[PDB]
Each structure stands twice: as structure tokens, then as C-alpha cells.
Symmetry: C3
Subunit: 412 residues, 3 copies
């Protein structure tokens, strides 16, 4: 059982669930139908469990990439807008919501890293990456630095690498290319080279993590950081005089950061397929639907053009969206996890001297590719161990030289 004649929605408790419920109210008052919004724990964990017995929420709200696996398990119902409607959203957000060519979620809001500079010690920010070292001569010479951001994690380093032509997978004709990794090429190489050069030239540090990186900007210690929206509130506290903007060009190229997208999926097991659509198209994805949620907890930049323009009047929001256009969507496939991991150790070793640029990046391509094949066999092993006859664990691994065979046979 799910509902029937009523809507039950799921959204992460950290979001504007209060503001959303009031749209469910405007909706009960317009159609006479009850909207119950819920905020459970590990819902992104619980969902695939219950949705799979035919249960859970009618609608679900989450970052888009987690949906790849949902839509894969066949958990999301394919959605049905007219062309006239899709024209109301920045068209690239539509890219964030398709799988084997099928649209599977409504895209709510948009996340991306931007460039954050302390307006006090840097009134004008660098328009390109290549200025930053030479500018360090200035700032290091008043006992300050020019830039500091997390180096322990690829998500942060990736906008530079990708800039010159680097890329995860070839998204092309509404479809990803799982052989075409693009992390070995010309652009990724020069990208990671620059990044390592700075850590050799001593413009940066390789044990720079999150705690370490964030602090320094918050204490007017470095002029710039790279980070996304989720970070604002803490700079706000610090009292540090700040601004937010486009990412500096590298080799005349825009930096290409990874875009995450809040999305609204419809449970494939929902009786109320028609109502939910109705709620999302006609009530939520409206200026007052979004302005509503946004009031409870701000959304970053929004998907709806109309409301983006009204919201864009924040220089900080303006940047977030501008960068998010200049960026690449983040893939919702299985393969993505392996990539992350391989590129982590790529940059760890390259920046630690451990390995050269040209070699480590090539390793990530081949080292991360050998895992995608390994990950599906691991799922094949547990399915042949399952039955083969929400706790819940979980023998797990490891494998090696195990079986097994099959059964017997019928006949007569």
C-alpha cells in the first residue's frame, strides 16, 4: 500500500519541508486532496527497499544522481510534460533527469561550486587561473595567501582538470558513453599539471583538507576559496567581508564544475500518478511554490527561469547559476563511484609527488575502468547467493575461487 486519492511526499529534513507542506496545503484547498510531507532518516536508503515491495511515498525529493540507480531498479515512473512546459526551465537541467532516454524526475534546484573572495584583501578577483601564482607574490608578501581549497577530494579539483577538455564520460545524444572516459587527454593533463605546479611552486599545500581549507577564508587568511552554497552560513558567522563569482578561466577556458540537482521523482508504484504530476507541474514548480520552499531553507539557484530571474538579484546566486551553466552535470550511473575513487588516488599521488601527472591520470582511466566490470560481478555474486535458496546484513565479501553450479532439470 502507498495511498490512493491522496499524496504522500518524501523530502530530506534539512530542506524546506515546511514551505513545501504549505504548497500541499494550497493544493488540498484547491483540489480537496491531502498532501503529507515526510522527513525520515536514510530515506534515500529506505526508499529503494519499500518502493520495491510497492510501498513508500508517491513523490520523492533528492539530488538527481541517486536517481540513476532508482530508475535503474525500475523504481521511477517516466514523466510526461508538454514541450510548452519544459521551456520554462533552463533546458540543461532536463539533461540531469533522463536515463536510457526517459525523463524520470522533475528538477527542482541547482547546486555548484563558485569562487569566494574576501572583498577586503581582494577587491577584484582574478579573471583567470594563471594570474593567481604571480599575484601570490603580492599576498604571501603581507603574510597572506591567494587561494586555498580542499585537495583531499576530487569534486573540488575536478573543475580545473575538466576545464581544458577533461571529462568523465561522453554524454551525447541523451546518452552516456561508458567506454569514453575523458581523463587521459590533453586537457586533463595540463589541468592536473598546473595544479601540481602550484603545489611545487608552493602556492598551495597537499594536506589541505576541508576543516583546514574552510577555516582560513573565514579568518581572512587567504584571499580566495572554492566552495558551494552549503558553505555560506559559516562565512556569514565569521563576519568576513565576502563575495561570490564565476570561476577563473584556465587556458581561456571556463572551469567546468559538477552540477547537482534537487529532483522530484514519482514512485512507479503510485496510484496517484496523475495527481502528483498535477501537484508538481501546477502547484510546486510555480513562483510561489518555489518561493515558498525557498523561504524555509534557501535553494541556491532555481531551475525555473521565471523565478531564477527574481532570485538572480543575489550576486551570490547569480554566480552559482552562471558557474552551473559553465559546468557539466554529474552522472547518475553505477560507473560514477569507481571514477570518483580512481580520480581520488589519481590526484592524491600526483600532488604528493608519489607519481607523475601523465602516468597517474592514465592509471585512473585504466584503474577506474577495471572496477566497473568488477562491481557488476560483485552484484552478480550476491544475487546468486541471495535466493538462491530493512535489517539488514550482510555476509558481503570477499570472493576469490568460489562457485557455484546450477541445479538438475525437469524432463518427462
Amino acid at each position: 500500500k502507498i495511498e490512493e486519492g491522496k499524496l504522500v511526499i518524501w523530502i530530506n529534513g534539512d530542506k524546506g519541508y515546511n514551505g513545501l507542506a504549505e504548497v500541499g496545503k494550497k493544493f488540498e484547498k484547491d483540489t480537496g486532496i491531502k498532501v503529507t510531507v515526510e522527513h525520515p532518516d536514510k530515506l534515500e536508503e529506505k526508499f529503494p527497499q519499500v518502493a520495491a515491495t510497492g510501498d513508500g511515498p508517491d513523490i520523492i525529493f533528492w539530488a538527481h544522481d541517486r536517481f540513476g540507480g532508482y530508475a535503474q531498479s525500475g523504481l521511477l515512473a517516466e514523466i510526461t510534460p508538454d514541450k510548452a512546459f519544459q521551456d520554462k526551465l533552463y533546458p540543461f537541467t532536463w539533461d540531469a533527469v533522463r536515463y536510457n532516454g526517459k525523463l524520470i524526475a522533475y528538477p527542482i534546484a541547482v547546486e555548484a561550486l563558485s569562487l569566494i573572495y574576501n572583498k577586503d584583501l581582494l577587491p577584484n578577483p582574478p579573471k583567470t587561473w594563471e594570474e593567481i601564482p604571480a599575484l601570490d607574490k603580492e599576498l604571501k608578501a603581507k603574510g597572506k595567501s591567494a587561494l586555498m581549497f580542499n585537495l583531499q577530494e576530487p569534486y573540488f579539483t575536478w573543475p580545473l582538470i575538466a576545464a581544458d577538455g577533461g571529462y568523465a564520460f561522453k554524454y551525447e545524444n541523451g546518452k552516456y558513453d561508458i567506454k569514453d572516459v575523458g581523463v587521459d587527454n590533453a586537457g586533463a593533463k595540463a589541468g592536473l599539471t598546473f595544479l601540481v605546479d602550484l603545489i611545487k611552486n608552493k602556492h598551495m599545500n597537499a594536506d589541505t583538507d576541508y576543516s583546514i581549507a574552510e577555516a582560513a577564508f573565514n579568518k581572512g587568511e587567504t584571499a580566495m576559496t572554492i566552495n558551494g552554497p552549503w558553505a555560506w552560513s559559516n562565512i556569514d558567522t565569521s563576519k568576513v567581508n565576502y563575495g561570490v563569482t564565476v570561476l577563473p578561466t584556465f587556458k581561456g577556458q571556463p572551469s567546468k564544475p559538477f552540477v547537482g540537482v534537487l529532483s522530484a521523482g514519482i514512485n512507479a508504484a503510485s496510484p496517484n500518478k496523475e495527481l502528483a504530476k498535477e501537484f508538481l507541474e501546477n502547484y510546486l514548480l510555480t513562483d510561489e511554490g518555489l518561493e515558498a520552499v525557498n523561504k524555509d531553507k534557501p535553494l541556491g539557484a532555481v531551475a525555473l527561469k521565471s523565478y531564477e530571474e527574481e532570485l538572480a538579484k543575489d550576486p551570490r546566486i547569480a554566480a552559482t547559476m552562471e558557474n552551473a551553466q559553465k559546468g557539466e552535470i554529474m552522472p547518475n550511473i553505477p560507473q560514477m563511484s569507481a571514477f570518483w575513487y580512481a580520480v581520488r588516488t589519481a590526484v592524491i599521488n600526483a600532488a604528493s609527488g608519489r607519481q607523475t601527472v601523465d602516468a597517474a591520470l592514465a592509471a585512473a582511466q585504466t584503474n577506474a575502468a577495471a572496477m566497473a566490470t568488477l562491481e557488476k560481478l560483485m552484484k552478480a555474486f550476491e544475487s546468486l547467493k541471495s535466493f538462491q535458496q530493512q535489517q539488514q546484513q550482510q555476509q558481503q565479501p570477499p570472493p576469490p575461487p568460489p562457485p557455484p553450479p546450477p541445479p538438475q532439470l525437469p524432463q518427462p
Copy 2:
């Protein structure tokens, strides 16, 4: 014994081997050549060991699907009939015996599932699936259900899943796009959904199997069942007045049942290749040859067009042919082993509430691909270890 100079044939007990032994006789007149016929045991299991070391029969009769295995391993000789012999048989039986384009065996009998119904409870078969819920009440109102058959096995339940777009792997060119599985499409989805309803609406029981369903039908308890021509003999015995017909359409579409073709192949090792060809092409696949084998043990439909027409005079045989002319030829590849269990699972989850249709069905495809490539890599690794110690124990140790 590498055969040599004479013809030895393998084949199975459940077949008319004496009627074939009689074809070995007639042949022996005009060439003088002696055809022995052995009906050994698990000769789908002996043949790959005997013919590993150049031995076994010159020829083997078995179902086509097993031959892709033989054929793959390199065990069967590519055969060469001309244009003119080829048109003696339903061209569709030909794609049943191609491996990577090469014709590789001889087509004999054709096997498909059929609609089997009690003319006494029900005078008239439904051309349609949609109307089965309706029929059930008419019948259950007189202490009788409309339709019962094995729900546990995917091979029985496949035809409705297949009906509207479903397929194991895609065929395009005498070859099988193994990356083109289609149990996730809407067709499969629709068909599975429909069956699942029939179960939840108590028009059917999920614990229904071959035993129960064959029995219920044979005790005049359910107006209909789905079975193949193997079970015809029990229904005669039941003294139930049965008839057999084409399977019901779904969404206007014919049911798509898995086809099996009885097939004869030539040991890639056989010294007697020219011999065997003349025997089958000129003595067996003649109206009289099949007759003999059939008069011994019946064959169901046969690929030989002209004796096939004489057999359609039995209405039951006529519909086995109709059911199969519309069916999905059963694949002979490795990823078929895989595909069965994945579907066996999905269908059972879907029938039990365990999972939803879209889900249960959006797994097998992923599980089969992973289960197949798992099967192909683990047993090659096992064959690597097997012949590694078989070449070191008696060969490397032999020196002791």
C-alpha cells in the same frame, strides 16, 4: 573406436530409435553400409567427452539448443545442403540450426506449447487472454476453474511475457546480439502485469505447478491448461475429452512460446561425413523415413513440409505447428543458462508480492548480464585450473 567406415548414431530412449534402426536397414541395401544406433545414457553429457578425444557417434539426435554448446566447443561439422533441399523445410526451422552464420545440423521434429482444453466443460476455446477473467467466474460458478498451468517455471509463463515485445536476446542476422536483452521492455512488463493480476484476483494460485495443473485438468477440474505434446498420453488415459489449439492472443498479439527443434548433427570428427549426409538428405528426410521413426515413437510436428501436411490431419499436430510458426526459437548460447534463473526469480517475486513488476523485471536483465559474464569467466578459469593440473600430475609428475 573412431567410428570409421560405418555409421553409428546416438539418440535418446524417449524417441523412436527402432523406427530409425529401420531406416539404417533400408540404407544398408543401396550402399551396403551398416548403421548402428546406440541409445546410451545422458548422451547430451557423454557426447562432449567422447567427441573431445575424437570418439562418439558419427551422428547425434538432440534438441537444437544443446548444439550451440557442442557447435561452440568445436564438435559439429558444418553441413552443406543446396538451395533445393533447403526449401523442403519450413525456412524458419533453418535459423534454429545456425551458429555464427554457418548451418551446423539437421532439423527433424518441432516442439511448441499449446492450449489444451476440455471440450466437455468448455465447447470452445477463447482466442484471447483478456477474456480469461470473465470465463473464470462462468466456470467457478459450477465448481470449476477456467485455466490452470505451471506458474513456477518461466518457460510456461514466457509466452505471455514474450507476447507483446519480450525476448531473451535479439536475433538480427543468423546471429544473436547478446547485448540486446528484452525482458525489460513494455511488452514483457505488460504481459507480466496481466499474469500477476490473474493471481491477485484469485483467478489463479501462485503455488500452481505442473503436478497440480496437469492433475486438475486431468480430473476435469479446470477447463484449460497449457502443455506440450509430451503430456498427450496422460490426457487420453484420463478419458477426458480434450482438444488442442493455438494459444490465446494478448493485446491482439500471438503468444510467443519457446520453440525446440529435434536435431541431428555430424561429429566434426566423423570419418563418414559424406555417408551421413546421404543418409539424412536422401533416406531420413524423405516422407517414408520420418514415417518409420514416427510410427515407432511419434514426433509432433516435423520440419519436412510434405510429411508435415499429412500429419496436420491430426488437429493436435496442426496447432503445434501453428503455435511454433508464431513462436520464439530457443537460443543456443551460454547466456541462456543465465537468463532462465534470472527470469525464474523475477516471475516468482512478481507473483508473490515480494517485488513489483517493473522492479523484479529491471533486475534479471542486470543480473543475467552479470550472471552470464560471470558464468563465462568462472568456468573458463575452472577449465584453466582443470587442464593445468591434468598436464602436471600425469605429465609433470609422470617423471616420478
Copy 3:
């Protein structure tokens, strides 16, 4: 080590590093840039350890076959000899030094198996495989056999199996289609059928390894052997009147040896990529350059035309080049190892009578396309669980 404004070269201990060293002495004269030839142990093992931290020599000498792996690990630089200079080397050698479009090395020398025959027993060697049974029972009449060579290793047997149509992987674009394995076809089937026929008519023995074969020939027991230029020095010592010639044809088709190439590669981490190529293009890959190296030890046949034509005045060397020209350049890809032992097993079972040609030949294909991706999963385990954690 690691380098910086001077050159350092590695090349295996058993080669003309002295000639090579004395080219350094010439180069250093017109430049003032010191070259250093070192030949450390297991250098094909160590180089990928140290090229991987931005270290090792500036330039590396080893057979093209191991360079696949280096380039694939991003370890060597791309090389850009202009079109005029590629023209100086035999065109087909350039194929041995290309990896996914990229030119990754300079060919030097060429190696391949050849027919070595005893002149005293065999004034004139056969052009044909098929007449060897004739030849053998002509010879068994004087207690001598026609041919003995290494049957336990595919490298030696392949040239026959390949002769009528076999191939490892398909090549037709500086790229090796690895789903296209050609060990399952008519050519190779028959090519194996014949070899196996020889063995079961006693016209040849099943257990013939390398030594048995070297001995048999080196003590004039057998008229012919198949071997490469490495065997030569011992048939000098064995004092046998001997000839190195073209391999016999089969079903009218050139026998197809596997071709190996000594190649010179630049560390992608090398700070002197310019000099490196100036050295190689203007000092080493010149008559005098090779002449010198070739003097310390013979290179065999050489990838450079002009000086190749000088060495081809020696019939043995010329026959190496012609066999080389009719053979299969060796795949440098990873699926090549997987190729090897599978064909090693195919033969050993077909030749043992344990399996038919067709069964064994098809079984190798299952192993070739399975052990190749199993090695990819091997790297997915070790080089991940180790450096990953932990």
C-alpha cells in the same frame, strides 16, 4: 639520475652498449653533452617502477612488445620524426612503435625465426612444408631426421599455424581489435592439422623442446632447425656447415614468424626530450652510429634501409629480414599474454591426441577472451585494494 641537461641510456647487458657508448663519445664532442650508458639488472622491471615517480633513464632500449605496457601507463613520450626521416626506416617497423595512434618509439633492429639447415646433409633446403615427410624418410635411411625445432612453445610453432590465415588480434589502423581473435579459422585449423600430422606419422617427435633441438642440429643429427639469430653463435662452436634461410611456405603461403623490434624510447619525465631525439635521429640512427653498436655485438637485421642493405650482404641476416617482412609484428597489448599460454595449451593437447584440432583451437579462444578480462579484474583487485586501503 634522474637527469637534467645531459643524457643517460639504459639497454640490456647483453648488447652493443659499448658501440652505443662510443657513439656517446662522438655526440659529446660536437655538443659538450655527456651521455651515459648503464645496463642495470631486470631493467624492464625497474624502469616502470621509476618512470612512475618521474625518474629512471632519459632513454630506454627494449623490444617494442614491452613498450605497449609502458605507453599505456603513460611512461614514454610521443616522438615526432618528420616525414623525411620515417622514410629512412622500413615502413613496417614503424608499426611496431605505435600505440593508439601515437608514435611512441624508434625501431633499431629486427628479429624473427628462420630456417636453419645443415649444408652437408642438405645442399638445398625445401621451399615447402608439404615435402618434409618425403624429406624425412629419405633421411631416416641414413639415421638422420629432416627437421627438429621447439614444439613446447607457440612462438616457434605459430609461423606454421598462421601460414594459411591465422592471426593473434586484428590490426588495420594502429589499433588492435581484441574481440577479433584469429586462432579459430580455416588457415590456422589446417596449419595445425598439418603440424599434428607430422607428429603422428613419426616424421617428428611430440616432446621436442629447445635443448633437444639445439643439440640434434648442433651435432648434425637433423638437417634442419627453426631458430632466430640468437642460436647462431653455437652453430659456429658446433662447427657445422650451416645456412640461415627463408621459412618454408605452406599451402603456398609464406610462413608467418612473430616479429620483434629493439626500440628506443624516451622517458615522458625526461627534461631533455630535444637532445634525446637529436641524438637518436642524427647520431644513433645513422650508418656509423649503428656500425659501431653492431661492432660490439651484432644487431641482427636493422630497421634502417641504407645500413640494412650493407648487412644483408650476409645471407643469414638477409634471410632474417625477409622472414621478418613476411611475418606478424608482435602485439604489445595486454591481451597478448592471455593469447600465449592458451595457444601453448591448444597445441600441447592437440599434439598429445587429448583433443581434436578444432576442439583445442576453439578452446584456446574461450581462454584467450576470458583470461584477458580476468587479468583486468586482477588489476582491479591488487592495484586497488593495496594503494586504496589497504
